[PDB]
Design a protein around this ligand. Structure first.
Ligand SMILES: OC[C@H]1O[C@H](OC[C@H]2O[C@H](O[C@H]3[C@H](O)[C@@H](O)[C@@H](O)O[C@@H]3CO)[C@H](O)[C@@H](O)[C@@H]2O)[C@H](O)[C@@H](O)[C@@H]1O
Ligand SMILES: OC[C@H]1O[C@H](OC[C@H]2O[C@H](O)[C@H](O)[C@@H](O)[C@@H]2O)[C@H](O)[C@@H](O)[C@@H]1O
Length: 596
């Protein structure tokens, strides 16, 4: 019988955004501003918004988001917060959020709340929100300009050690949240932190890790559950620890830039220790995938520039990768650039994967970090499970020249006993019941499928190797007998601050008590326990925490099935299993099954 348990110690922000599904759908000004190397004029912003309202907002792309080129945004409130995107704009953020509202859309903002504009510093009348004793001028070290070493002289970096700093930063974050902004994109924190860029050299004064982590904690608290926090230049120190603890999204690639295949799949394949660890998103999504999934991080593959690609097959591959990885779906084509390419963004079956909360993983091949061994995960074969037990499966051919067959086998790779109905989502074709998804792919082409296992008496299997991992839990394959490609280990005691865990999203038709099974290994020489909970997306407890017991077995190659019952509510539940301080021993986890 199960006993009551304390809650697990977490190491992620664990917000409603990362718990509820994949990244947001939005449009971004980058397709204008990058090639122009200039802030978007207000009329161009307007014409793009009107175009989105009539053509993409109905497909869920209902955030219009600004980007950089903000040095020319100098006008601020009495507390130093920018009033609009650029000084040339006749209307402020509020006017544009309402204009968007009238078209069933919302405003996304790119800004870093550690930026302090020189114009605000120079106006002695401006003071920190709620702190009339602190002038905005009192927030900065003289000469400490953002991008100082490459000529920057319009934005200071905040000195977070100065009185008023927390109030300034939190006020800035809440300023946008209050304006109705659901998404805040915070860039240049690696430049803030270490004053360096691997593409350039020295860029400005460093501010250090402690200050970076403190600033992130302030931003997290101020954003709360109302506004999604995108970290656009993460250094990802310590396997992304501070970013995971404080943000919702992390960029995993070098900038889209001029777009096309070389930005999607080229440049370099190796890892480096500096921003960005991987250059192309095939490698970055693959390399950071151990940090993805419900309650962990959403990985951000940057912007889609459909018209910069050479063919429609490449455009499909671009979209399929973003969807496979659970990334935000960010259109950067302007109304002038879109041409006849709207279709790439508006395939309803592909979008349905994003709506349903697909967060895929590359096929794991070994436990070794991808940063150390590129053989450890397959950049070209992705799968993820939806809450209802169905799957998204994506197959890619990154060769420039050869046609290559790619296959995901439902038993050997995914770890299912059932096979599944397979639908090709670009052919819009039912392939019927099958044991695998396969495609003979032309160079740069891809295929994406919805795979729907049958459910004899409601049985739904969720493989651990394709779920979300936290606190040290991870993939392995070093004891035989597992179903699928492997299992999760690290569900053991350790020295750390966080408890290792696995999170599964599960969807059920009604509130009730459901039979749950856990296929596991345990050769610790004694009984082991893990803590199990069910929660709503908002974190509220549906069941548990309870200690579930796992009888000791003969060897680490021996697998058993522990039986239990779990209360779940109608719709989405997050079922988390982890090893707390009061748990005993250790297990390896292969899968869970729910009879729904
Ligand atoms: O006003 C701020 C900034 O706006 C533009 O840059 C926006 C882009 O900033 C980042 O890109 C940087 C790279 O990460 C660095 O490695 C290096 O190449 O420099 C660029 C910035 O030029 C971010 O990664 C992108 O997603 C943003 O679009 C202007 O280009 C800057 O000059 C302005 O300071
Ligand atoms: O404690 C559960 C664990 O037990 C064995 O591994 C022991 C030990 O092996 C290496 O030294 C690792 O670096 C440590 O982290 C492990 O504690 C089983 O082989 C393993 O499957 C299981 O998870």
């Amino acid at each position: 019988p199960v006993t009551a348990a304390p809650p697990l110690r977490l190491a992620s922000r664990n917000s409603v955004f990362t718990r509820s599904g994949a990244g947001p759908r939005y449009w971004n000004i980058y397709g204008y501003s990058f090639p122009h190397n200039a802030p978007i004029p207000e009329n161009e912003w307007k014409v793009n918004i009107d175009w989105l309202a009539g053509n993409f907002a109905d497909f869920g792309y209902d955030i219009a988001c600004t980007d950089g080129w903000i040095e020319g945004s100098s006008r601020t409130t009495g507390n130093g917060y920018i009033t609009s995107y650029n000084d040339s704009w006749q209307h402020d953020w509020a006017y544009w959020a309402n204009y968007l509202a009238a078209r069933k859309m919302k405003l996304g903002v790119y800004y870093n709340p550690l930026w302090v504009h020189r114009a605000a510093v120079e106006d002695a009348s401006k003071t920190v929100l709620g702190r009339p004793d602190v002038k905005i001028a009192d927030l900065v070290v003289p000469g400490d300009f953002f991008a100082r070493d490459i000529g920057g002289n319009q934005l200071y970096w905040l000195d977070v050690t100065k009185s008023g700093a927390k109030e300034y930063v939190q006020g800035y974050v809440r300023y946008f949240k209050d304006l109705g902004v659901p998404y805040l994109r915070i860039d240049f924190l690696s430049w803030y932190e270490d004053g360096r860029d691997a593409n350039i050299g020295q860029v400005n004064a460093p501010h250090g890790r402690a200050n970076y982590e403190l600033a992130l904690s302030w931003i997290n608290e101020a954003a709360g559950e109302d506004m999604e926090v995108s970290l656009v230049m993460p250094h990802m120190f310590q396997d992304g620890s501070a970013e995971l603890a404080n943000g919702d999204l992390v960029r995993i690639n070098a900038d889209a830039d001029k777009g096309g295949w070389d930005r999607l799949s080229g440049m370099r394949q190796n890892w480096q220790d500096a921003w960005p660890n991987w250059a192309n998103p095939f490698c970055g999504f693959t390399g950071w995938s151990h940090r993805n999934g419900r309650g962990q991080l959403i990985l951000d593959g940057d912007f889609m520039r459909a018209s910069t690609f050479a063919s429609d097959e490449e455009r499909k591959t671009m979209m399929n990768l973003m969807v496979a990885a659970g990334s935000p779906l960010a259109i950067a084509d302007t109304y002038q650039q879109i041409g006849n390419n709207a279709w790439v963004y508006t395939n309803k079956e592909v979008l349905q994967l994003n709506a349903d909360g697909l967060v895929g993983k590359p096929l794991y091949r070994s436990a070794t970090p991808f940063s150390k061994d590129p053989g450890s995960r397959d950049t070209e074969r992705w799968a993820g499970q939806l809450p209802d037990g169905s799957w998204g499966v994506a197959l890619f051919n990154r060769s420039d020249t050869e046609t290559v067959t790619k296959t995901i086998d439902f038993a050997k790779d995914l770890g299912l006993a059932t096979g599944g109905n397979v639908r090709d989502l670009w052919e819009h074709r039912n392939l019927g019941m099958d044991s695998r998804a396969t495609a003979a792919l032309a160079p740069h082409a891809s295929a994406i499928f919805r795979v729907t296992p049958p459910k004899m008496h409601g049985t739904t299997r969720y493989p651990a190797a394709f779920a979300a991992w936290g606190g040290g839990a991870g993939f392995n394959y070093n004891h035989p007998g597992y179903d699928g490609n492997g299992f999760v280990d690290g569900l053991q005691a350790g020295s750390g601050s966080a408890d290792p865990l696995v999170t599964f999203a599960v969807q059920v038709p009604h509130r009730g008590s459901y039979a749950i099974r856990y296929r596991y290994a345990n050769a610790t020489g004694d009984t082991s326990t893990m803590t199990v909970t069910a929660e709503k997306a908002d974190r509220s407890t549906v069941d548990g925490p309870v200690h579930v017991s796992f009888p000791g077995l003969a060897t680490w190659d021996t697998w058993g099935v522990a039986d239990g019952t779990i209360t779940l509510d109608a719709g989405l539940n997050l079922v988390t299993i982890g090893r707390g301080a009061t748990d005993k021993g250790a297990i390896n986890l292969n899968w869970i099954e729910l009879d729904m």
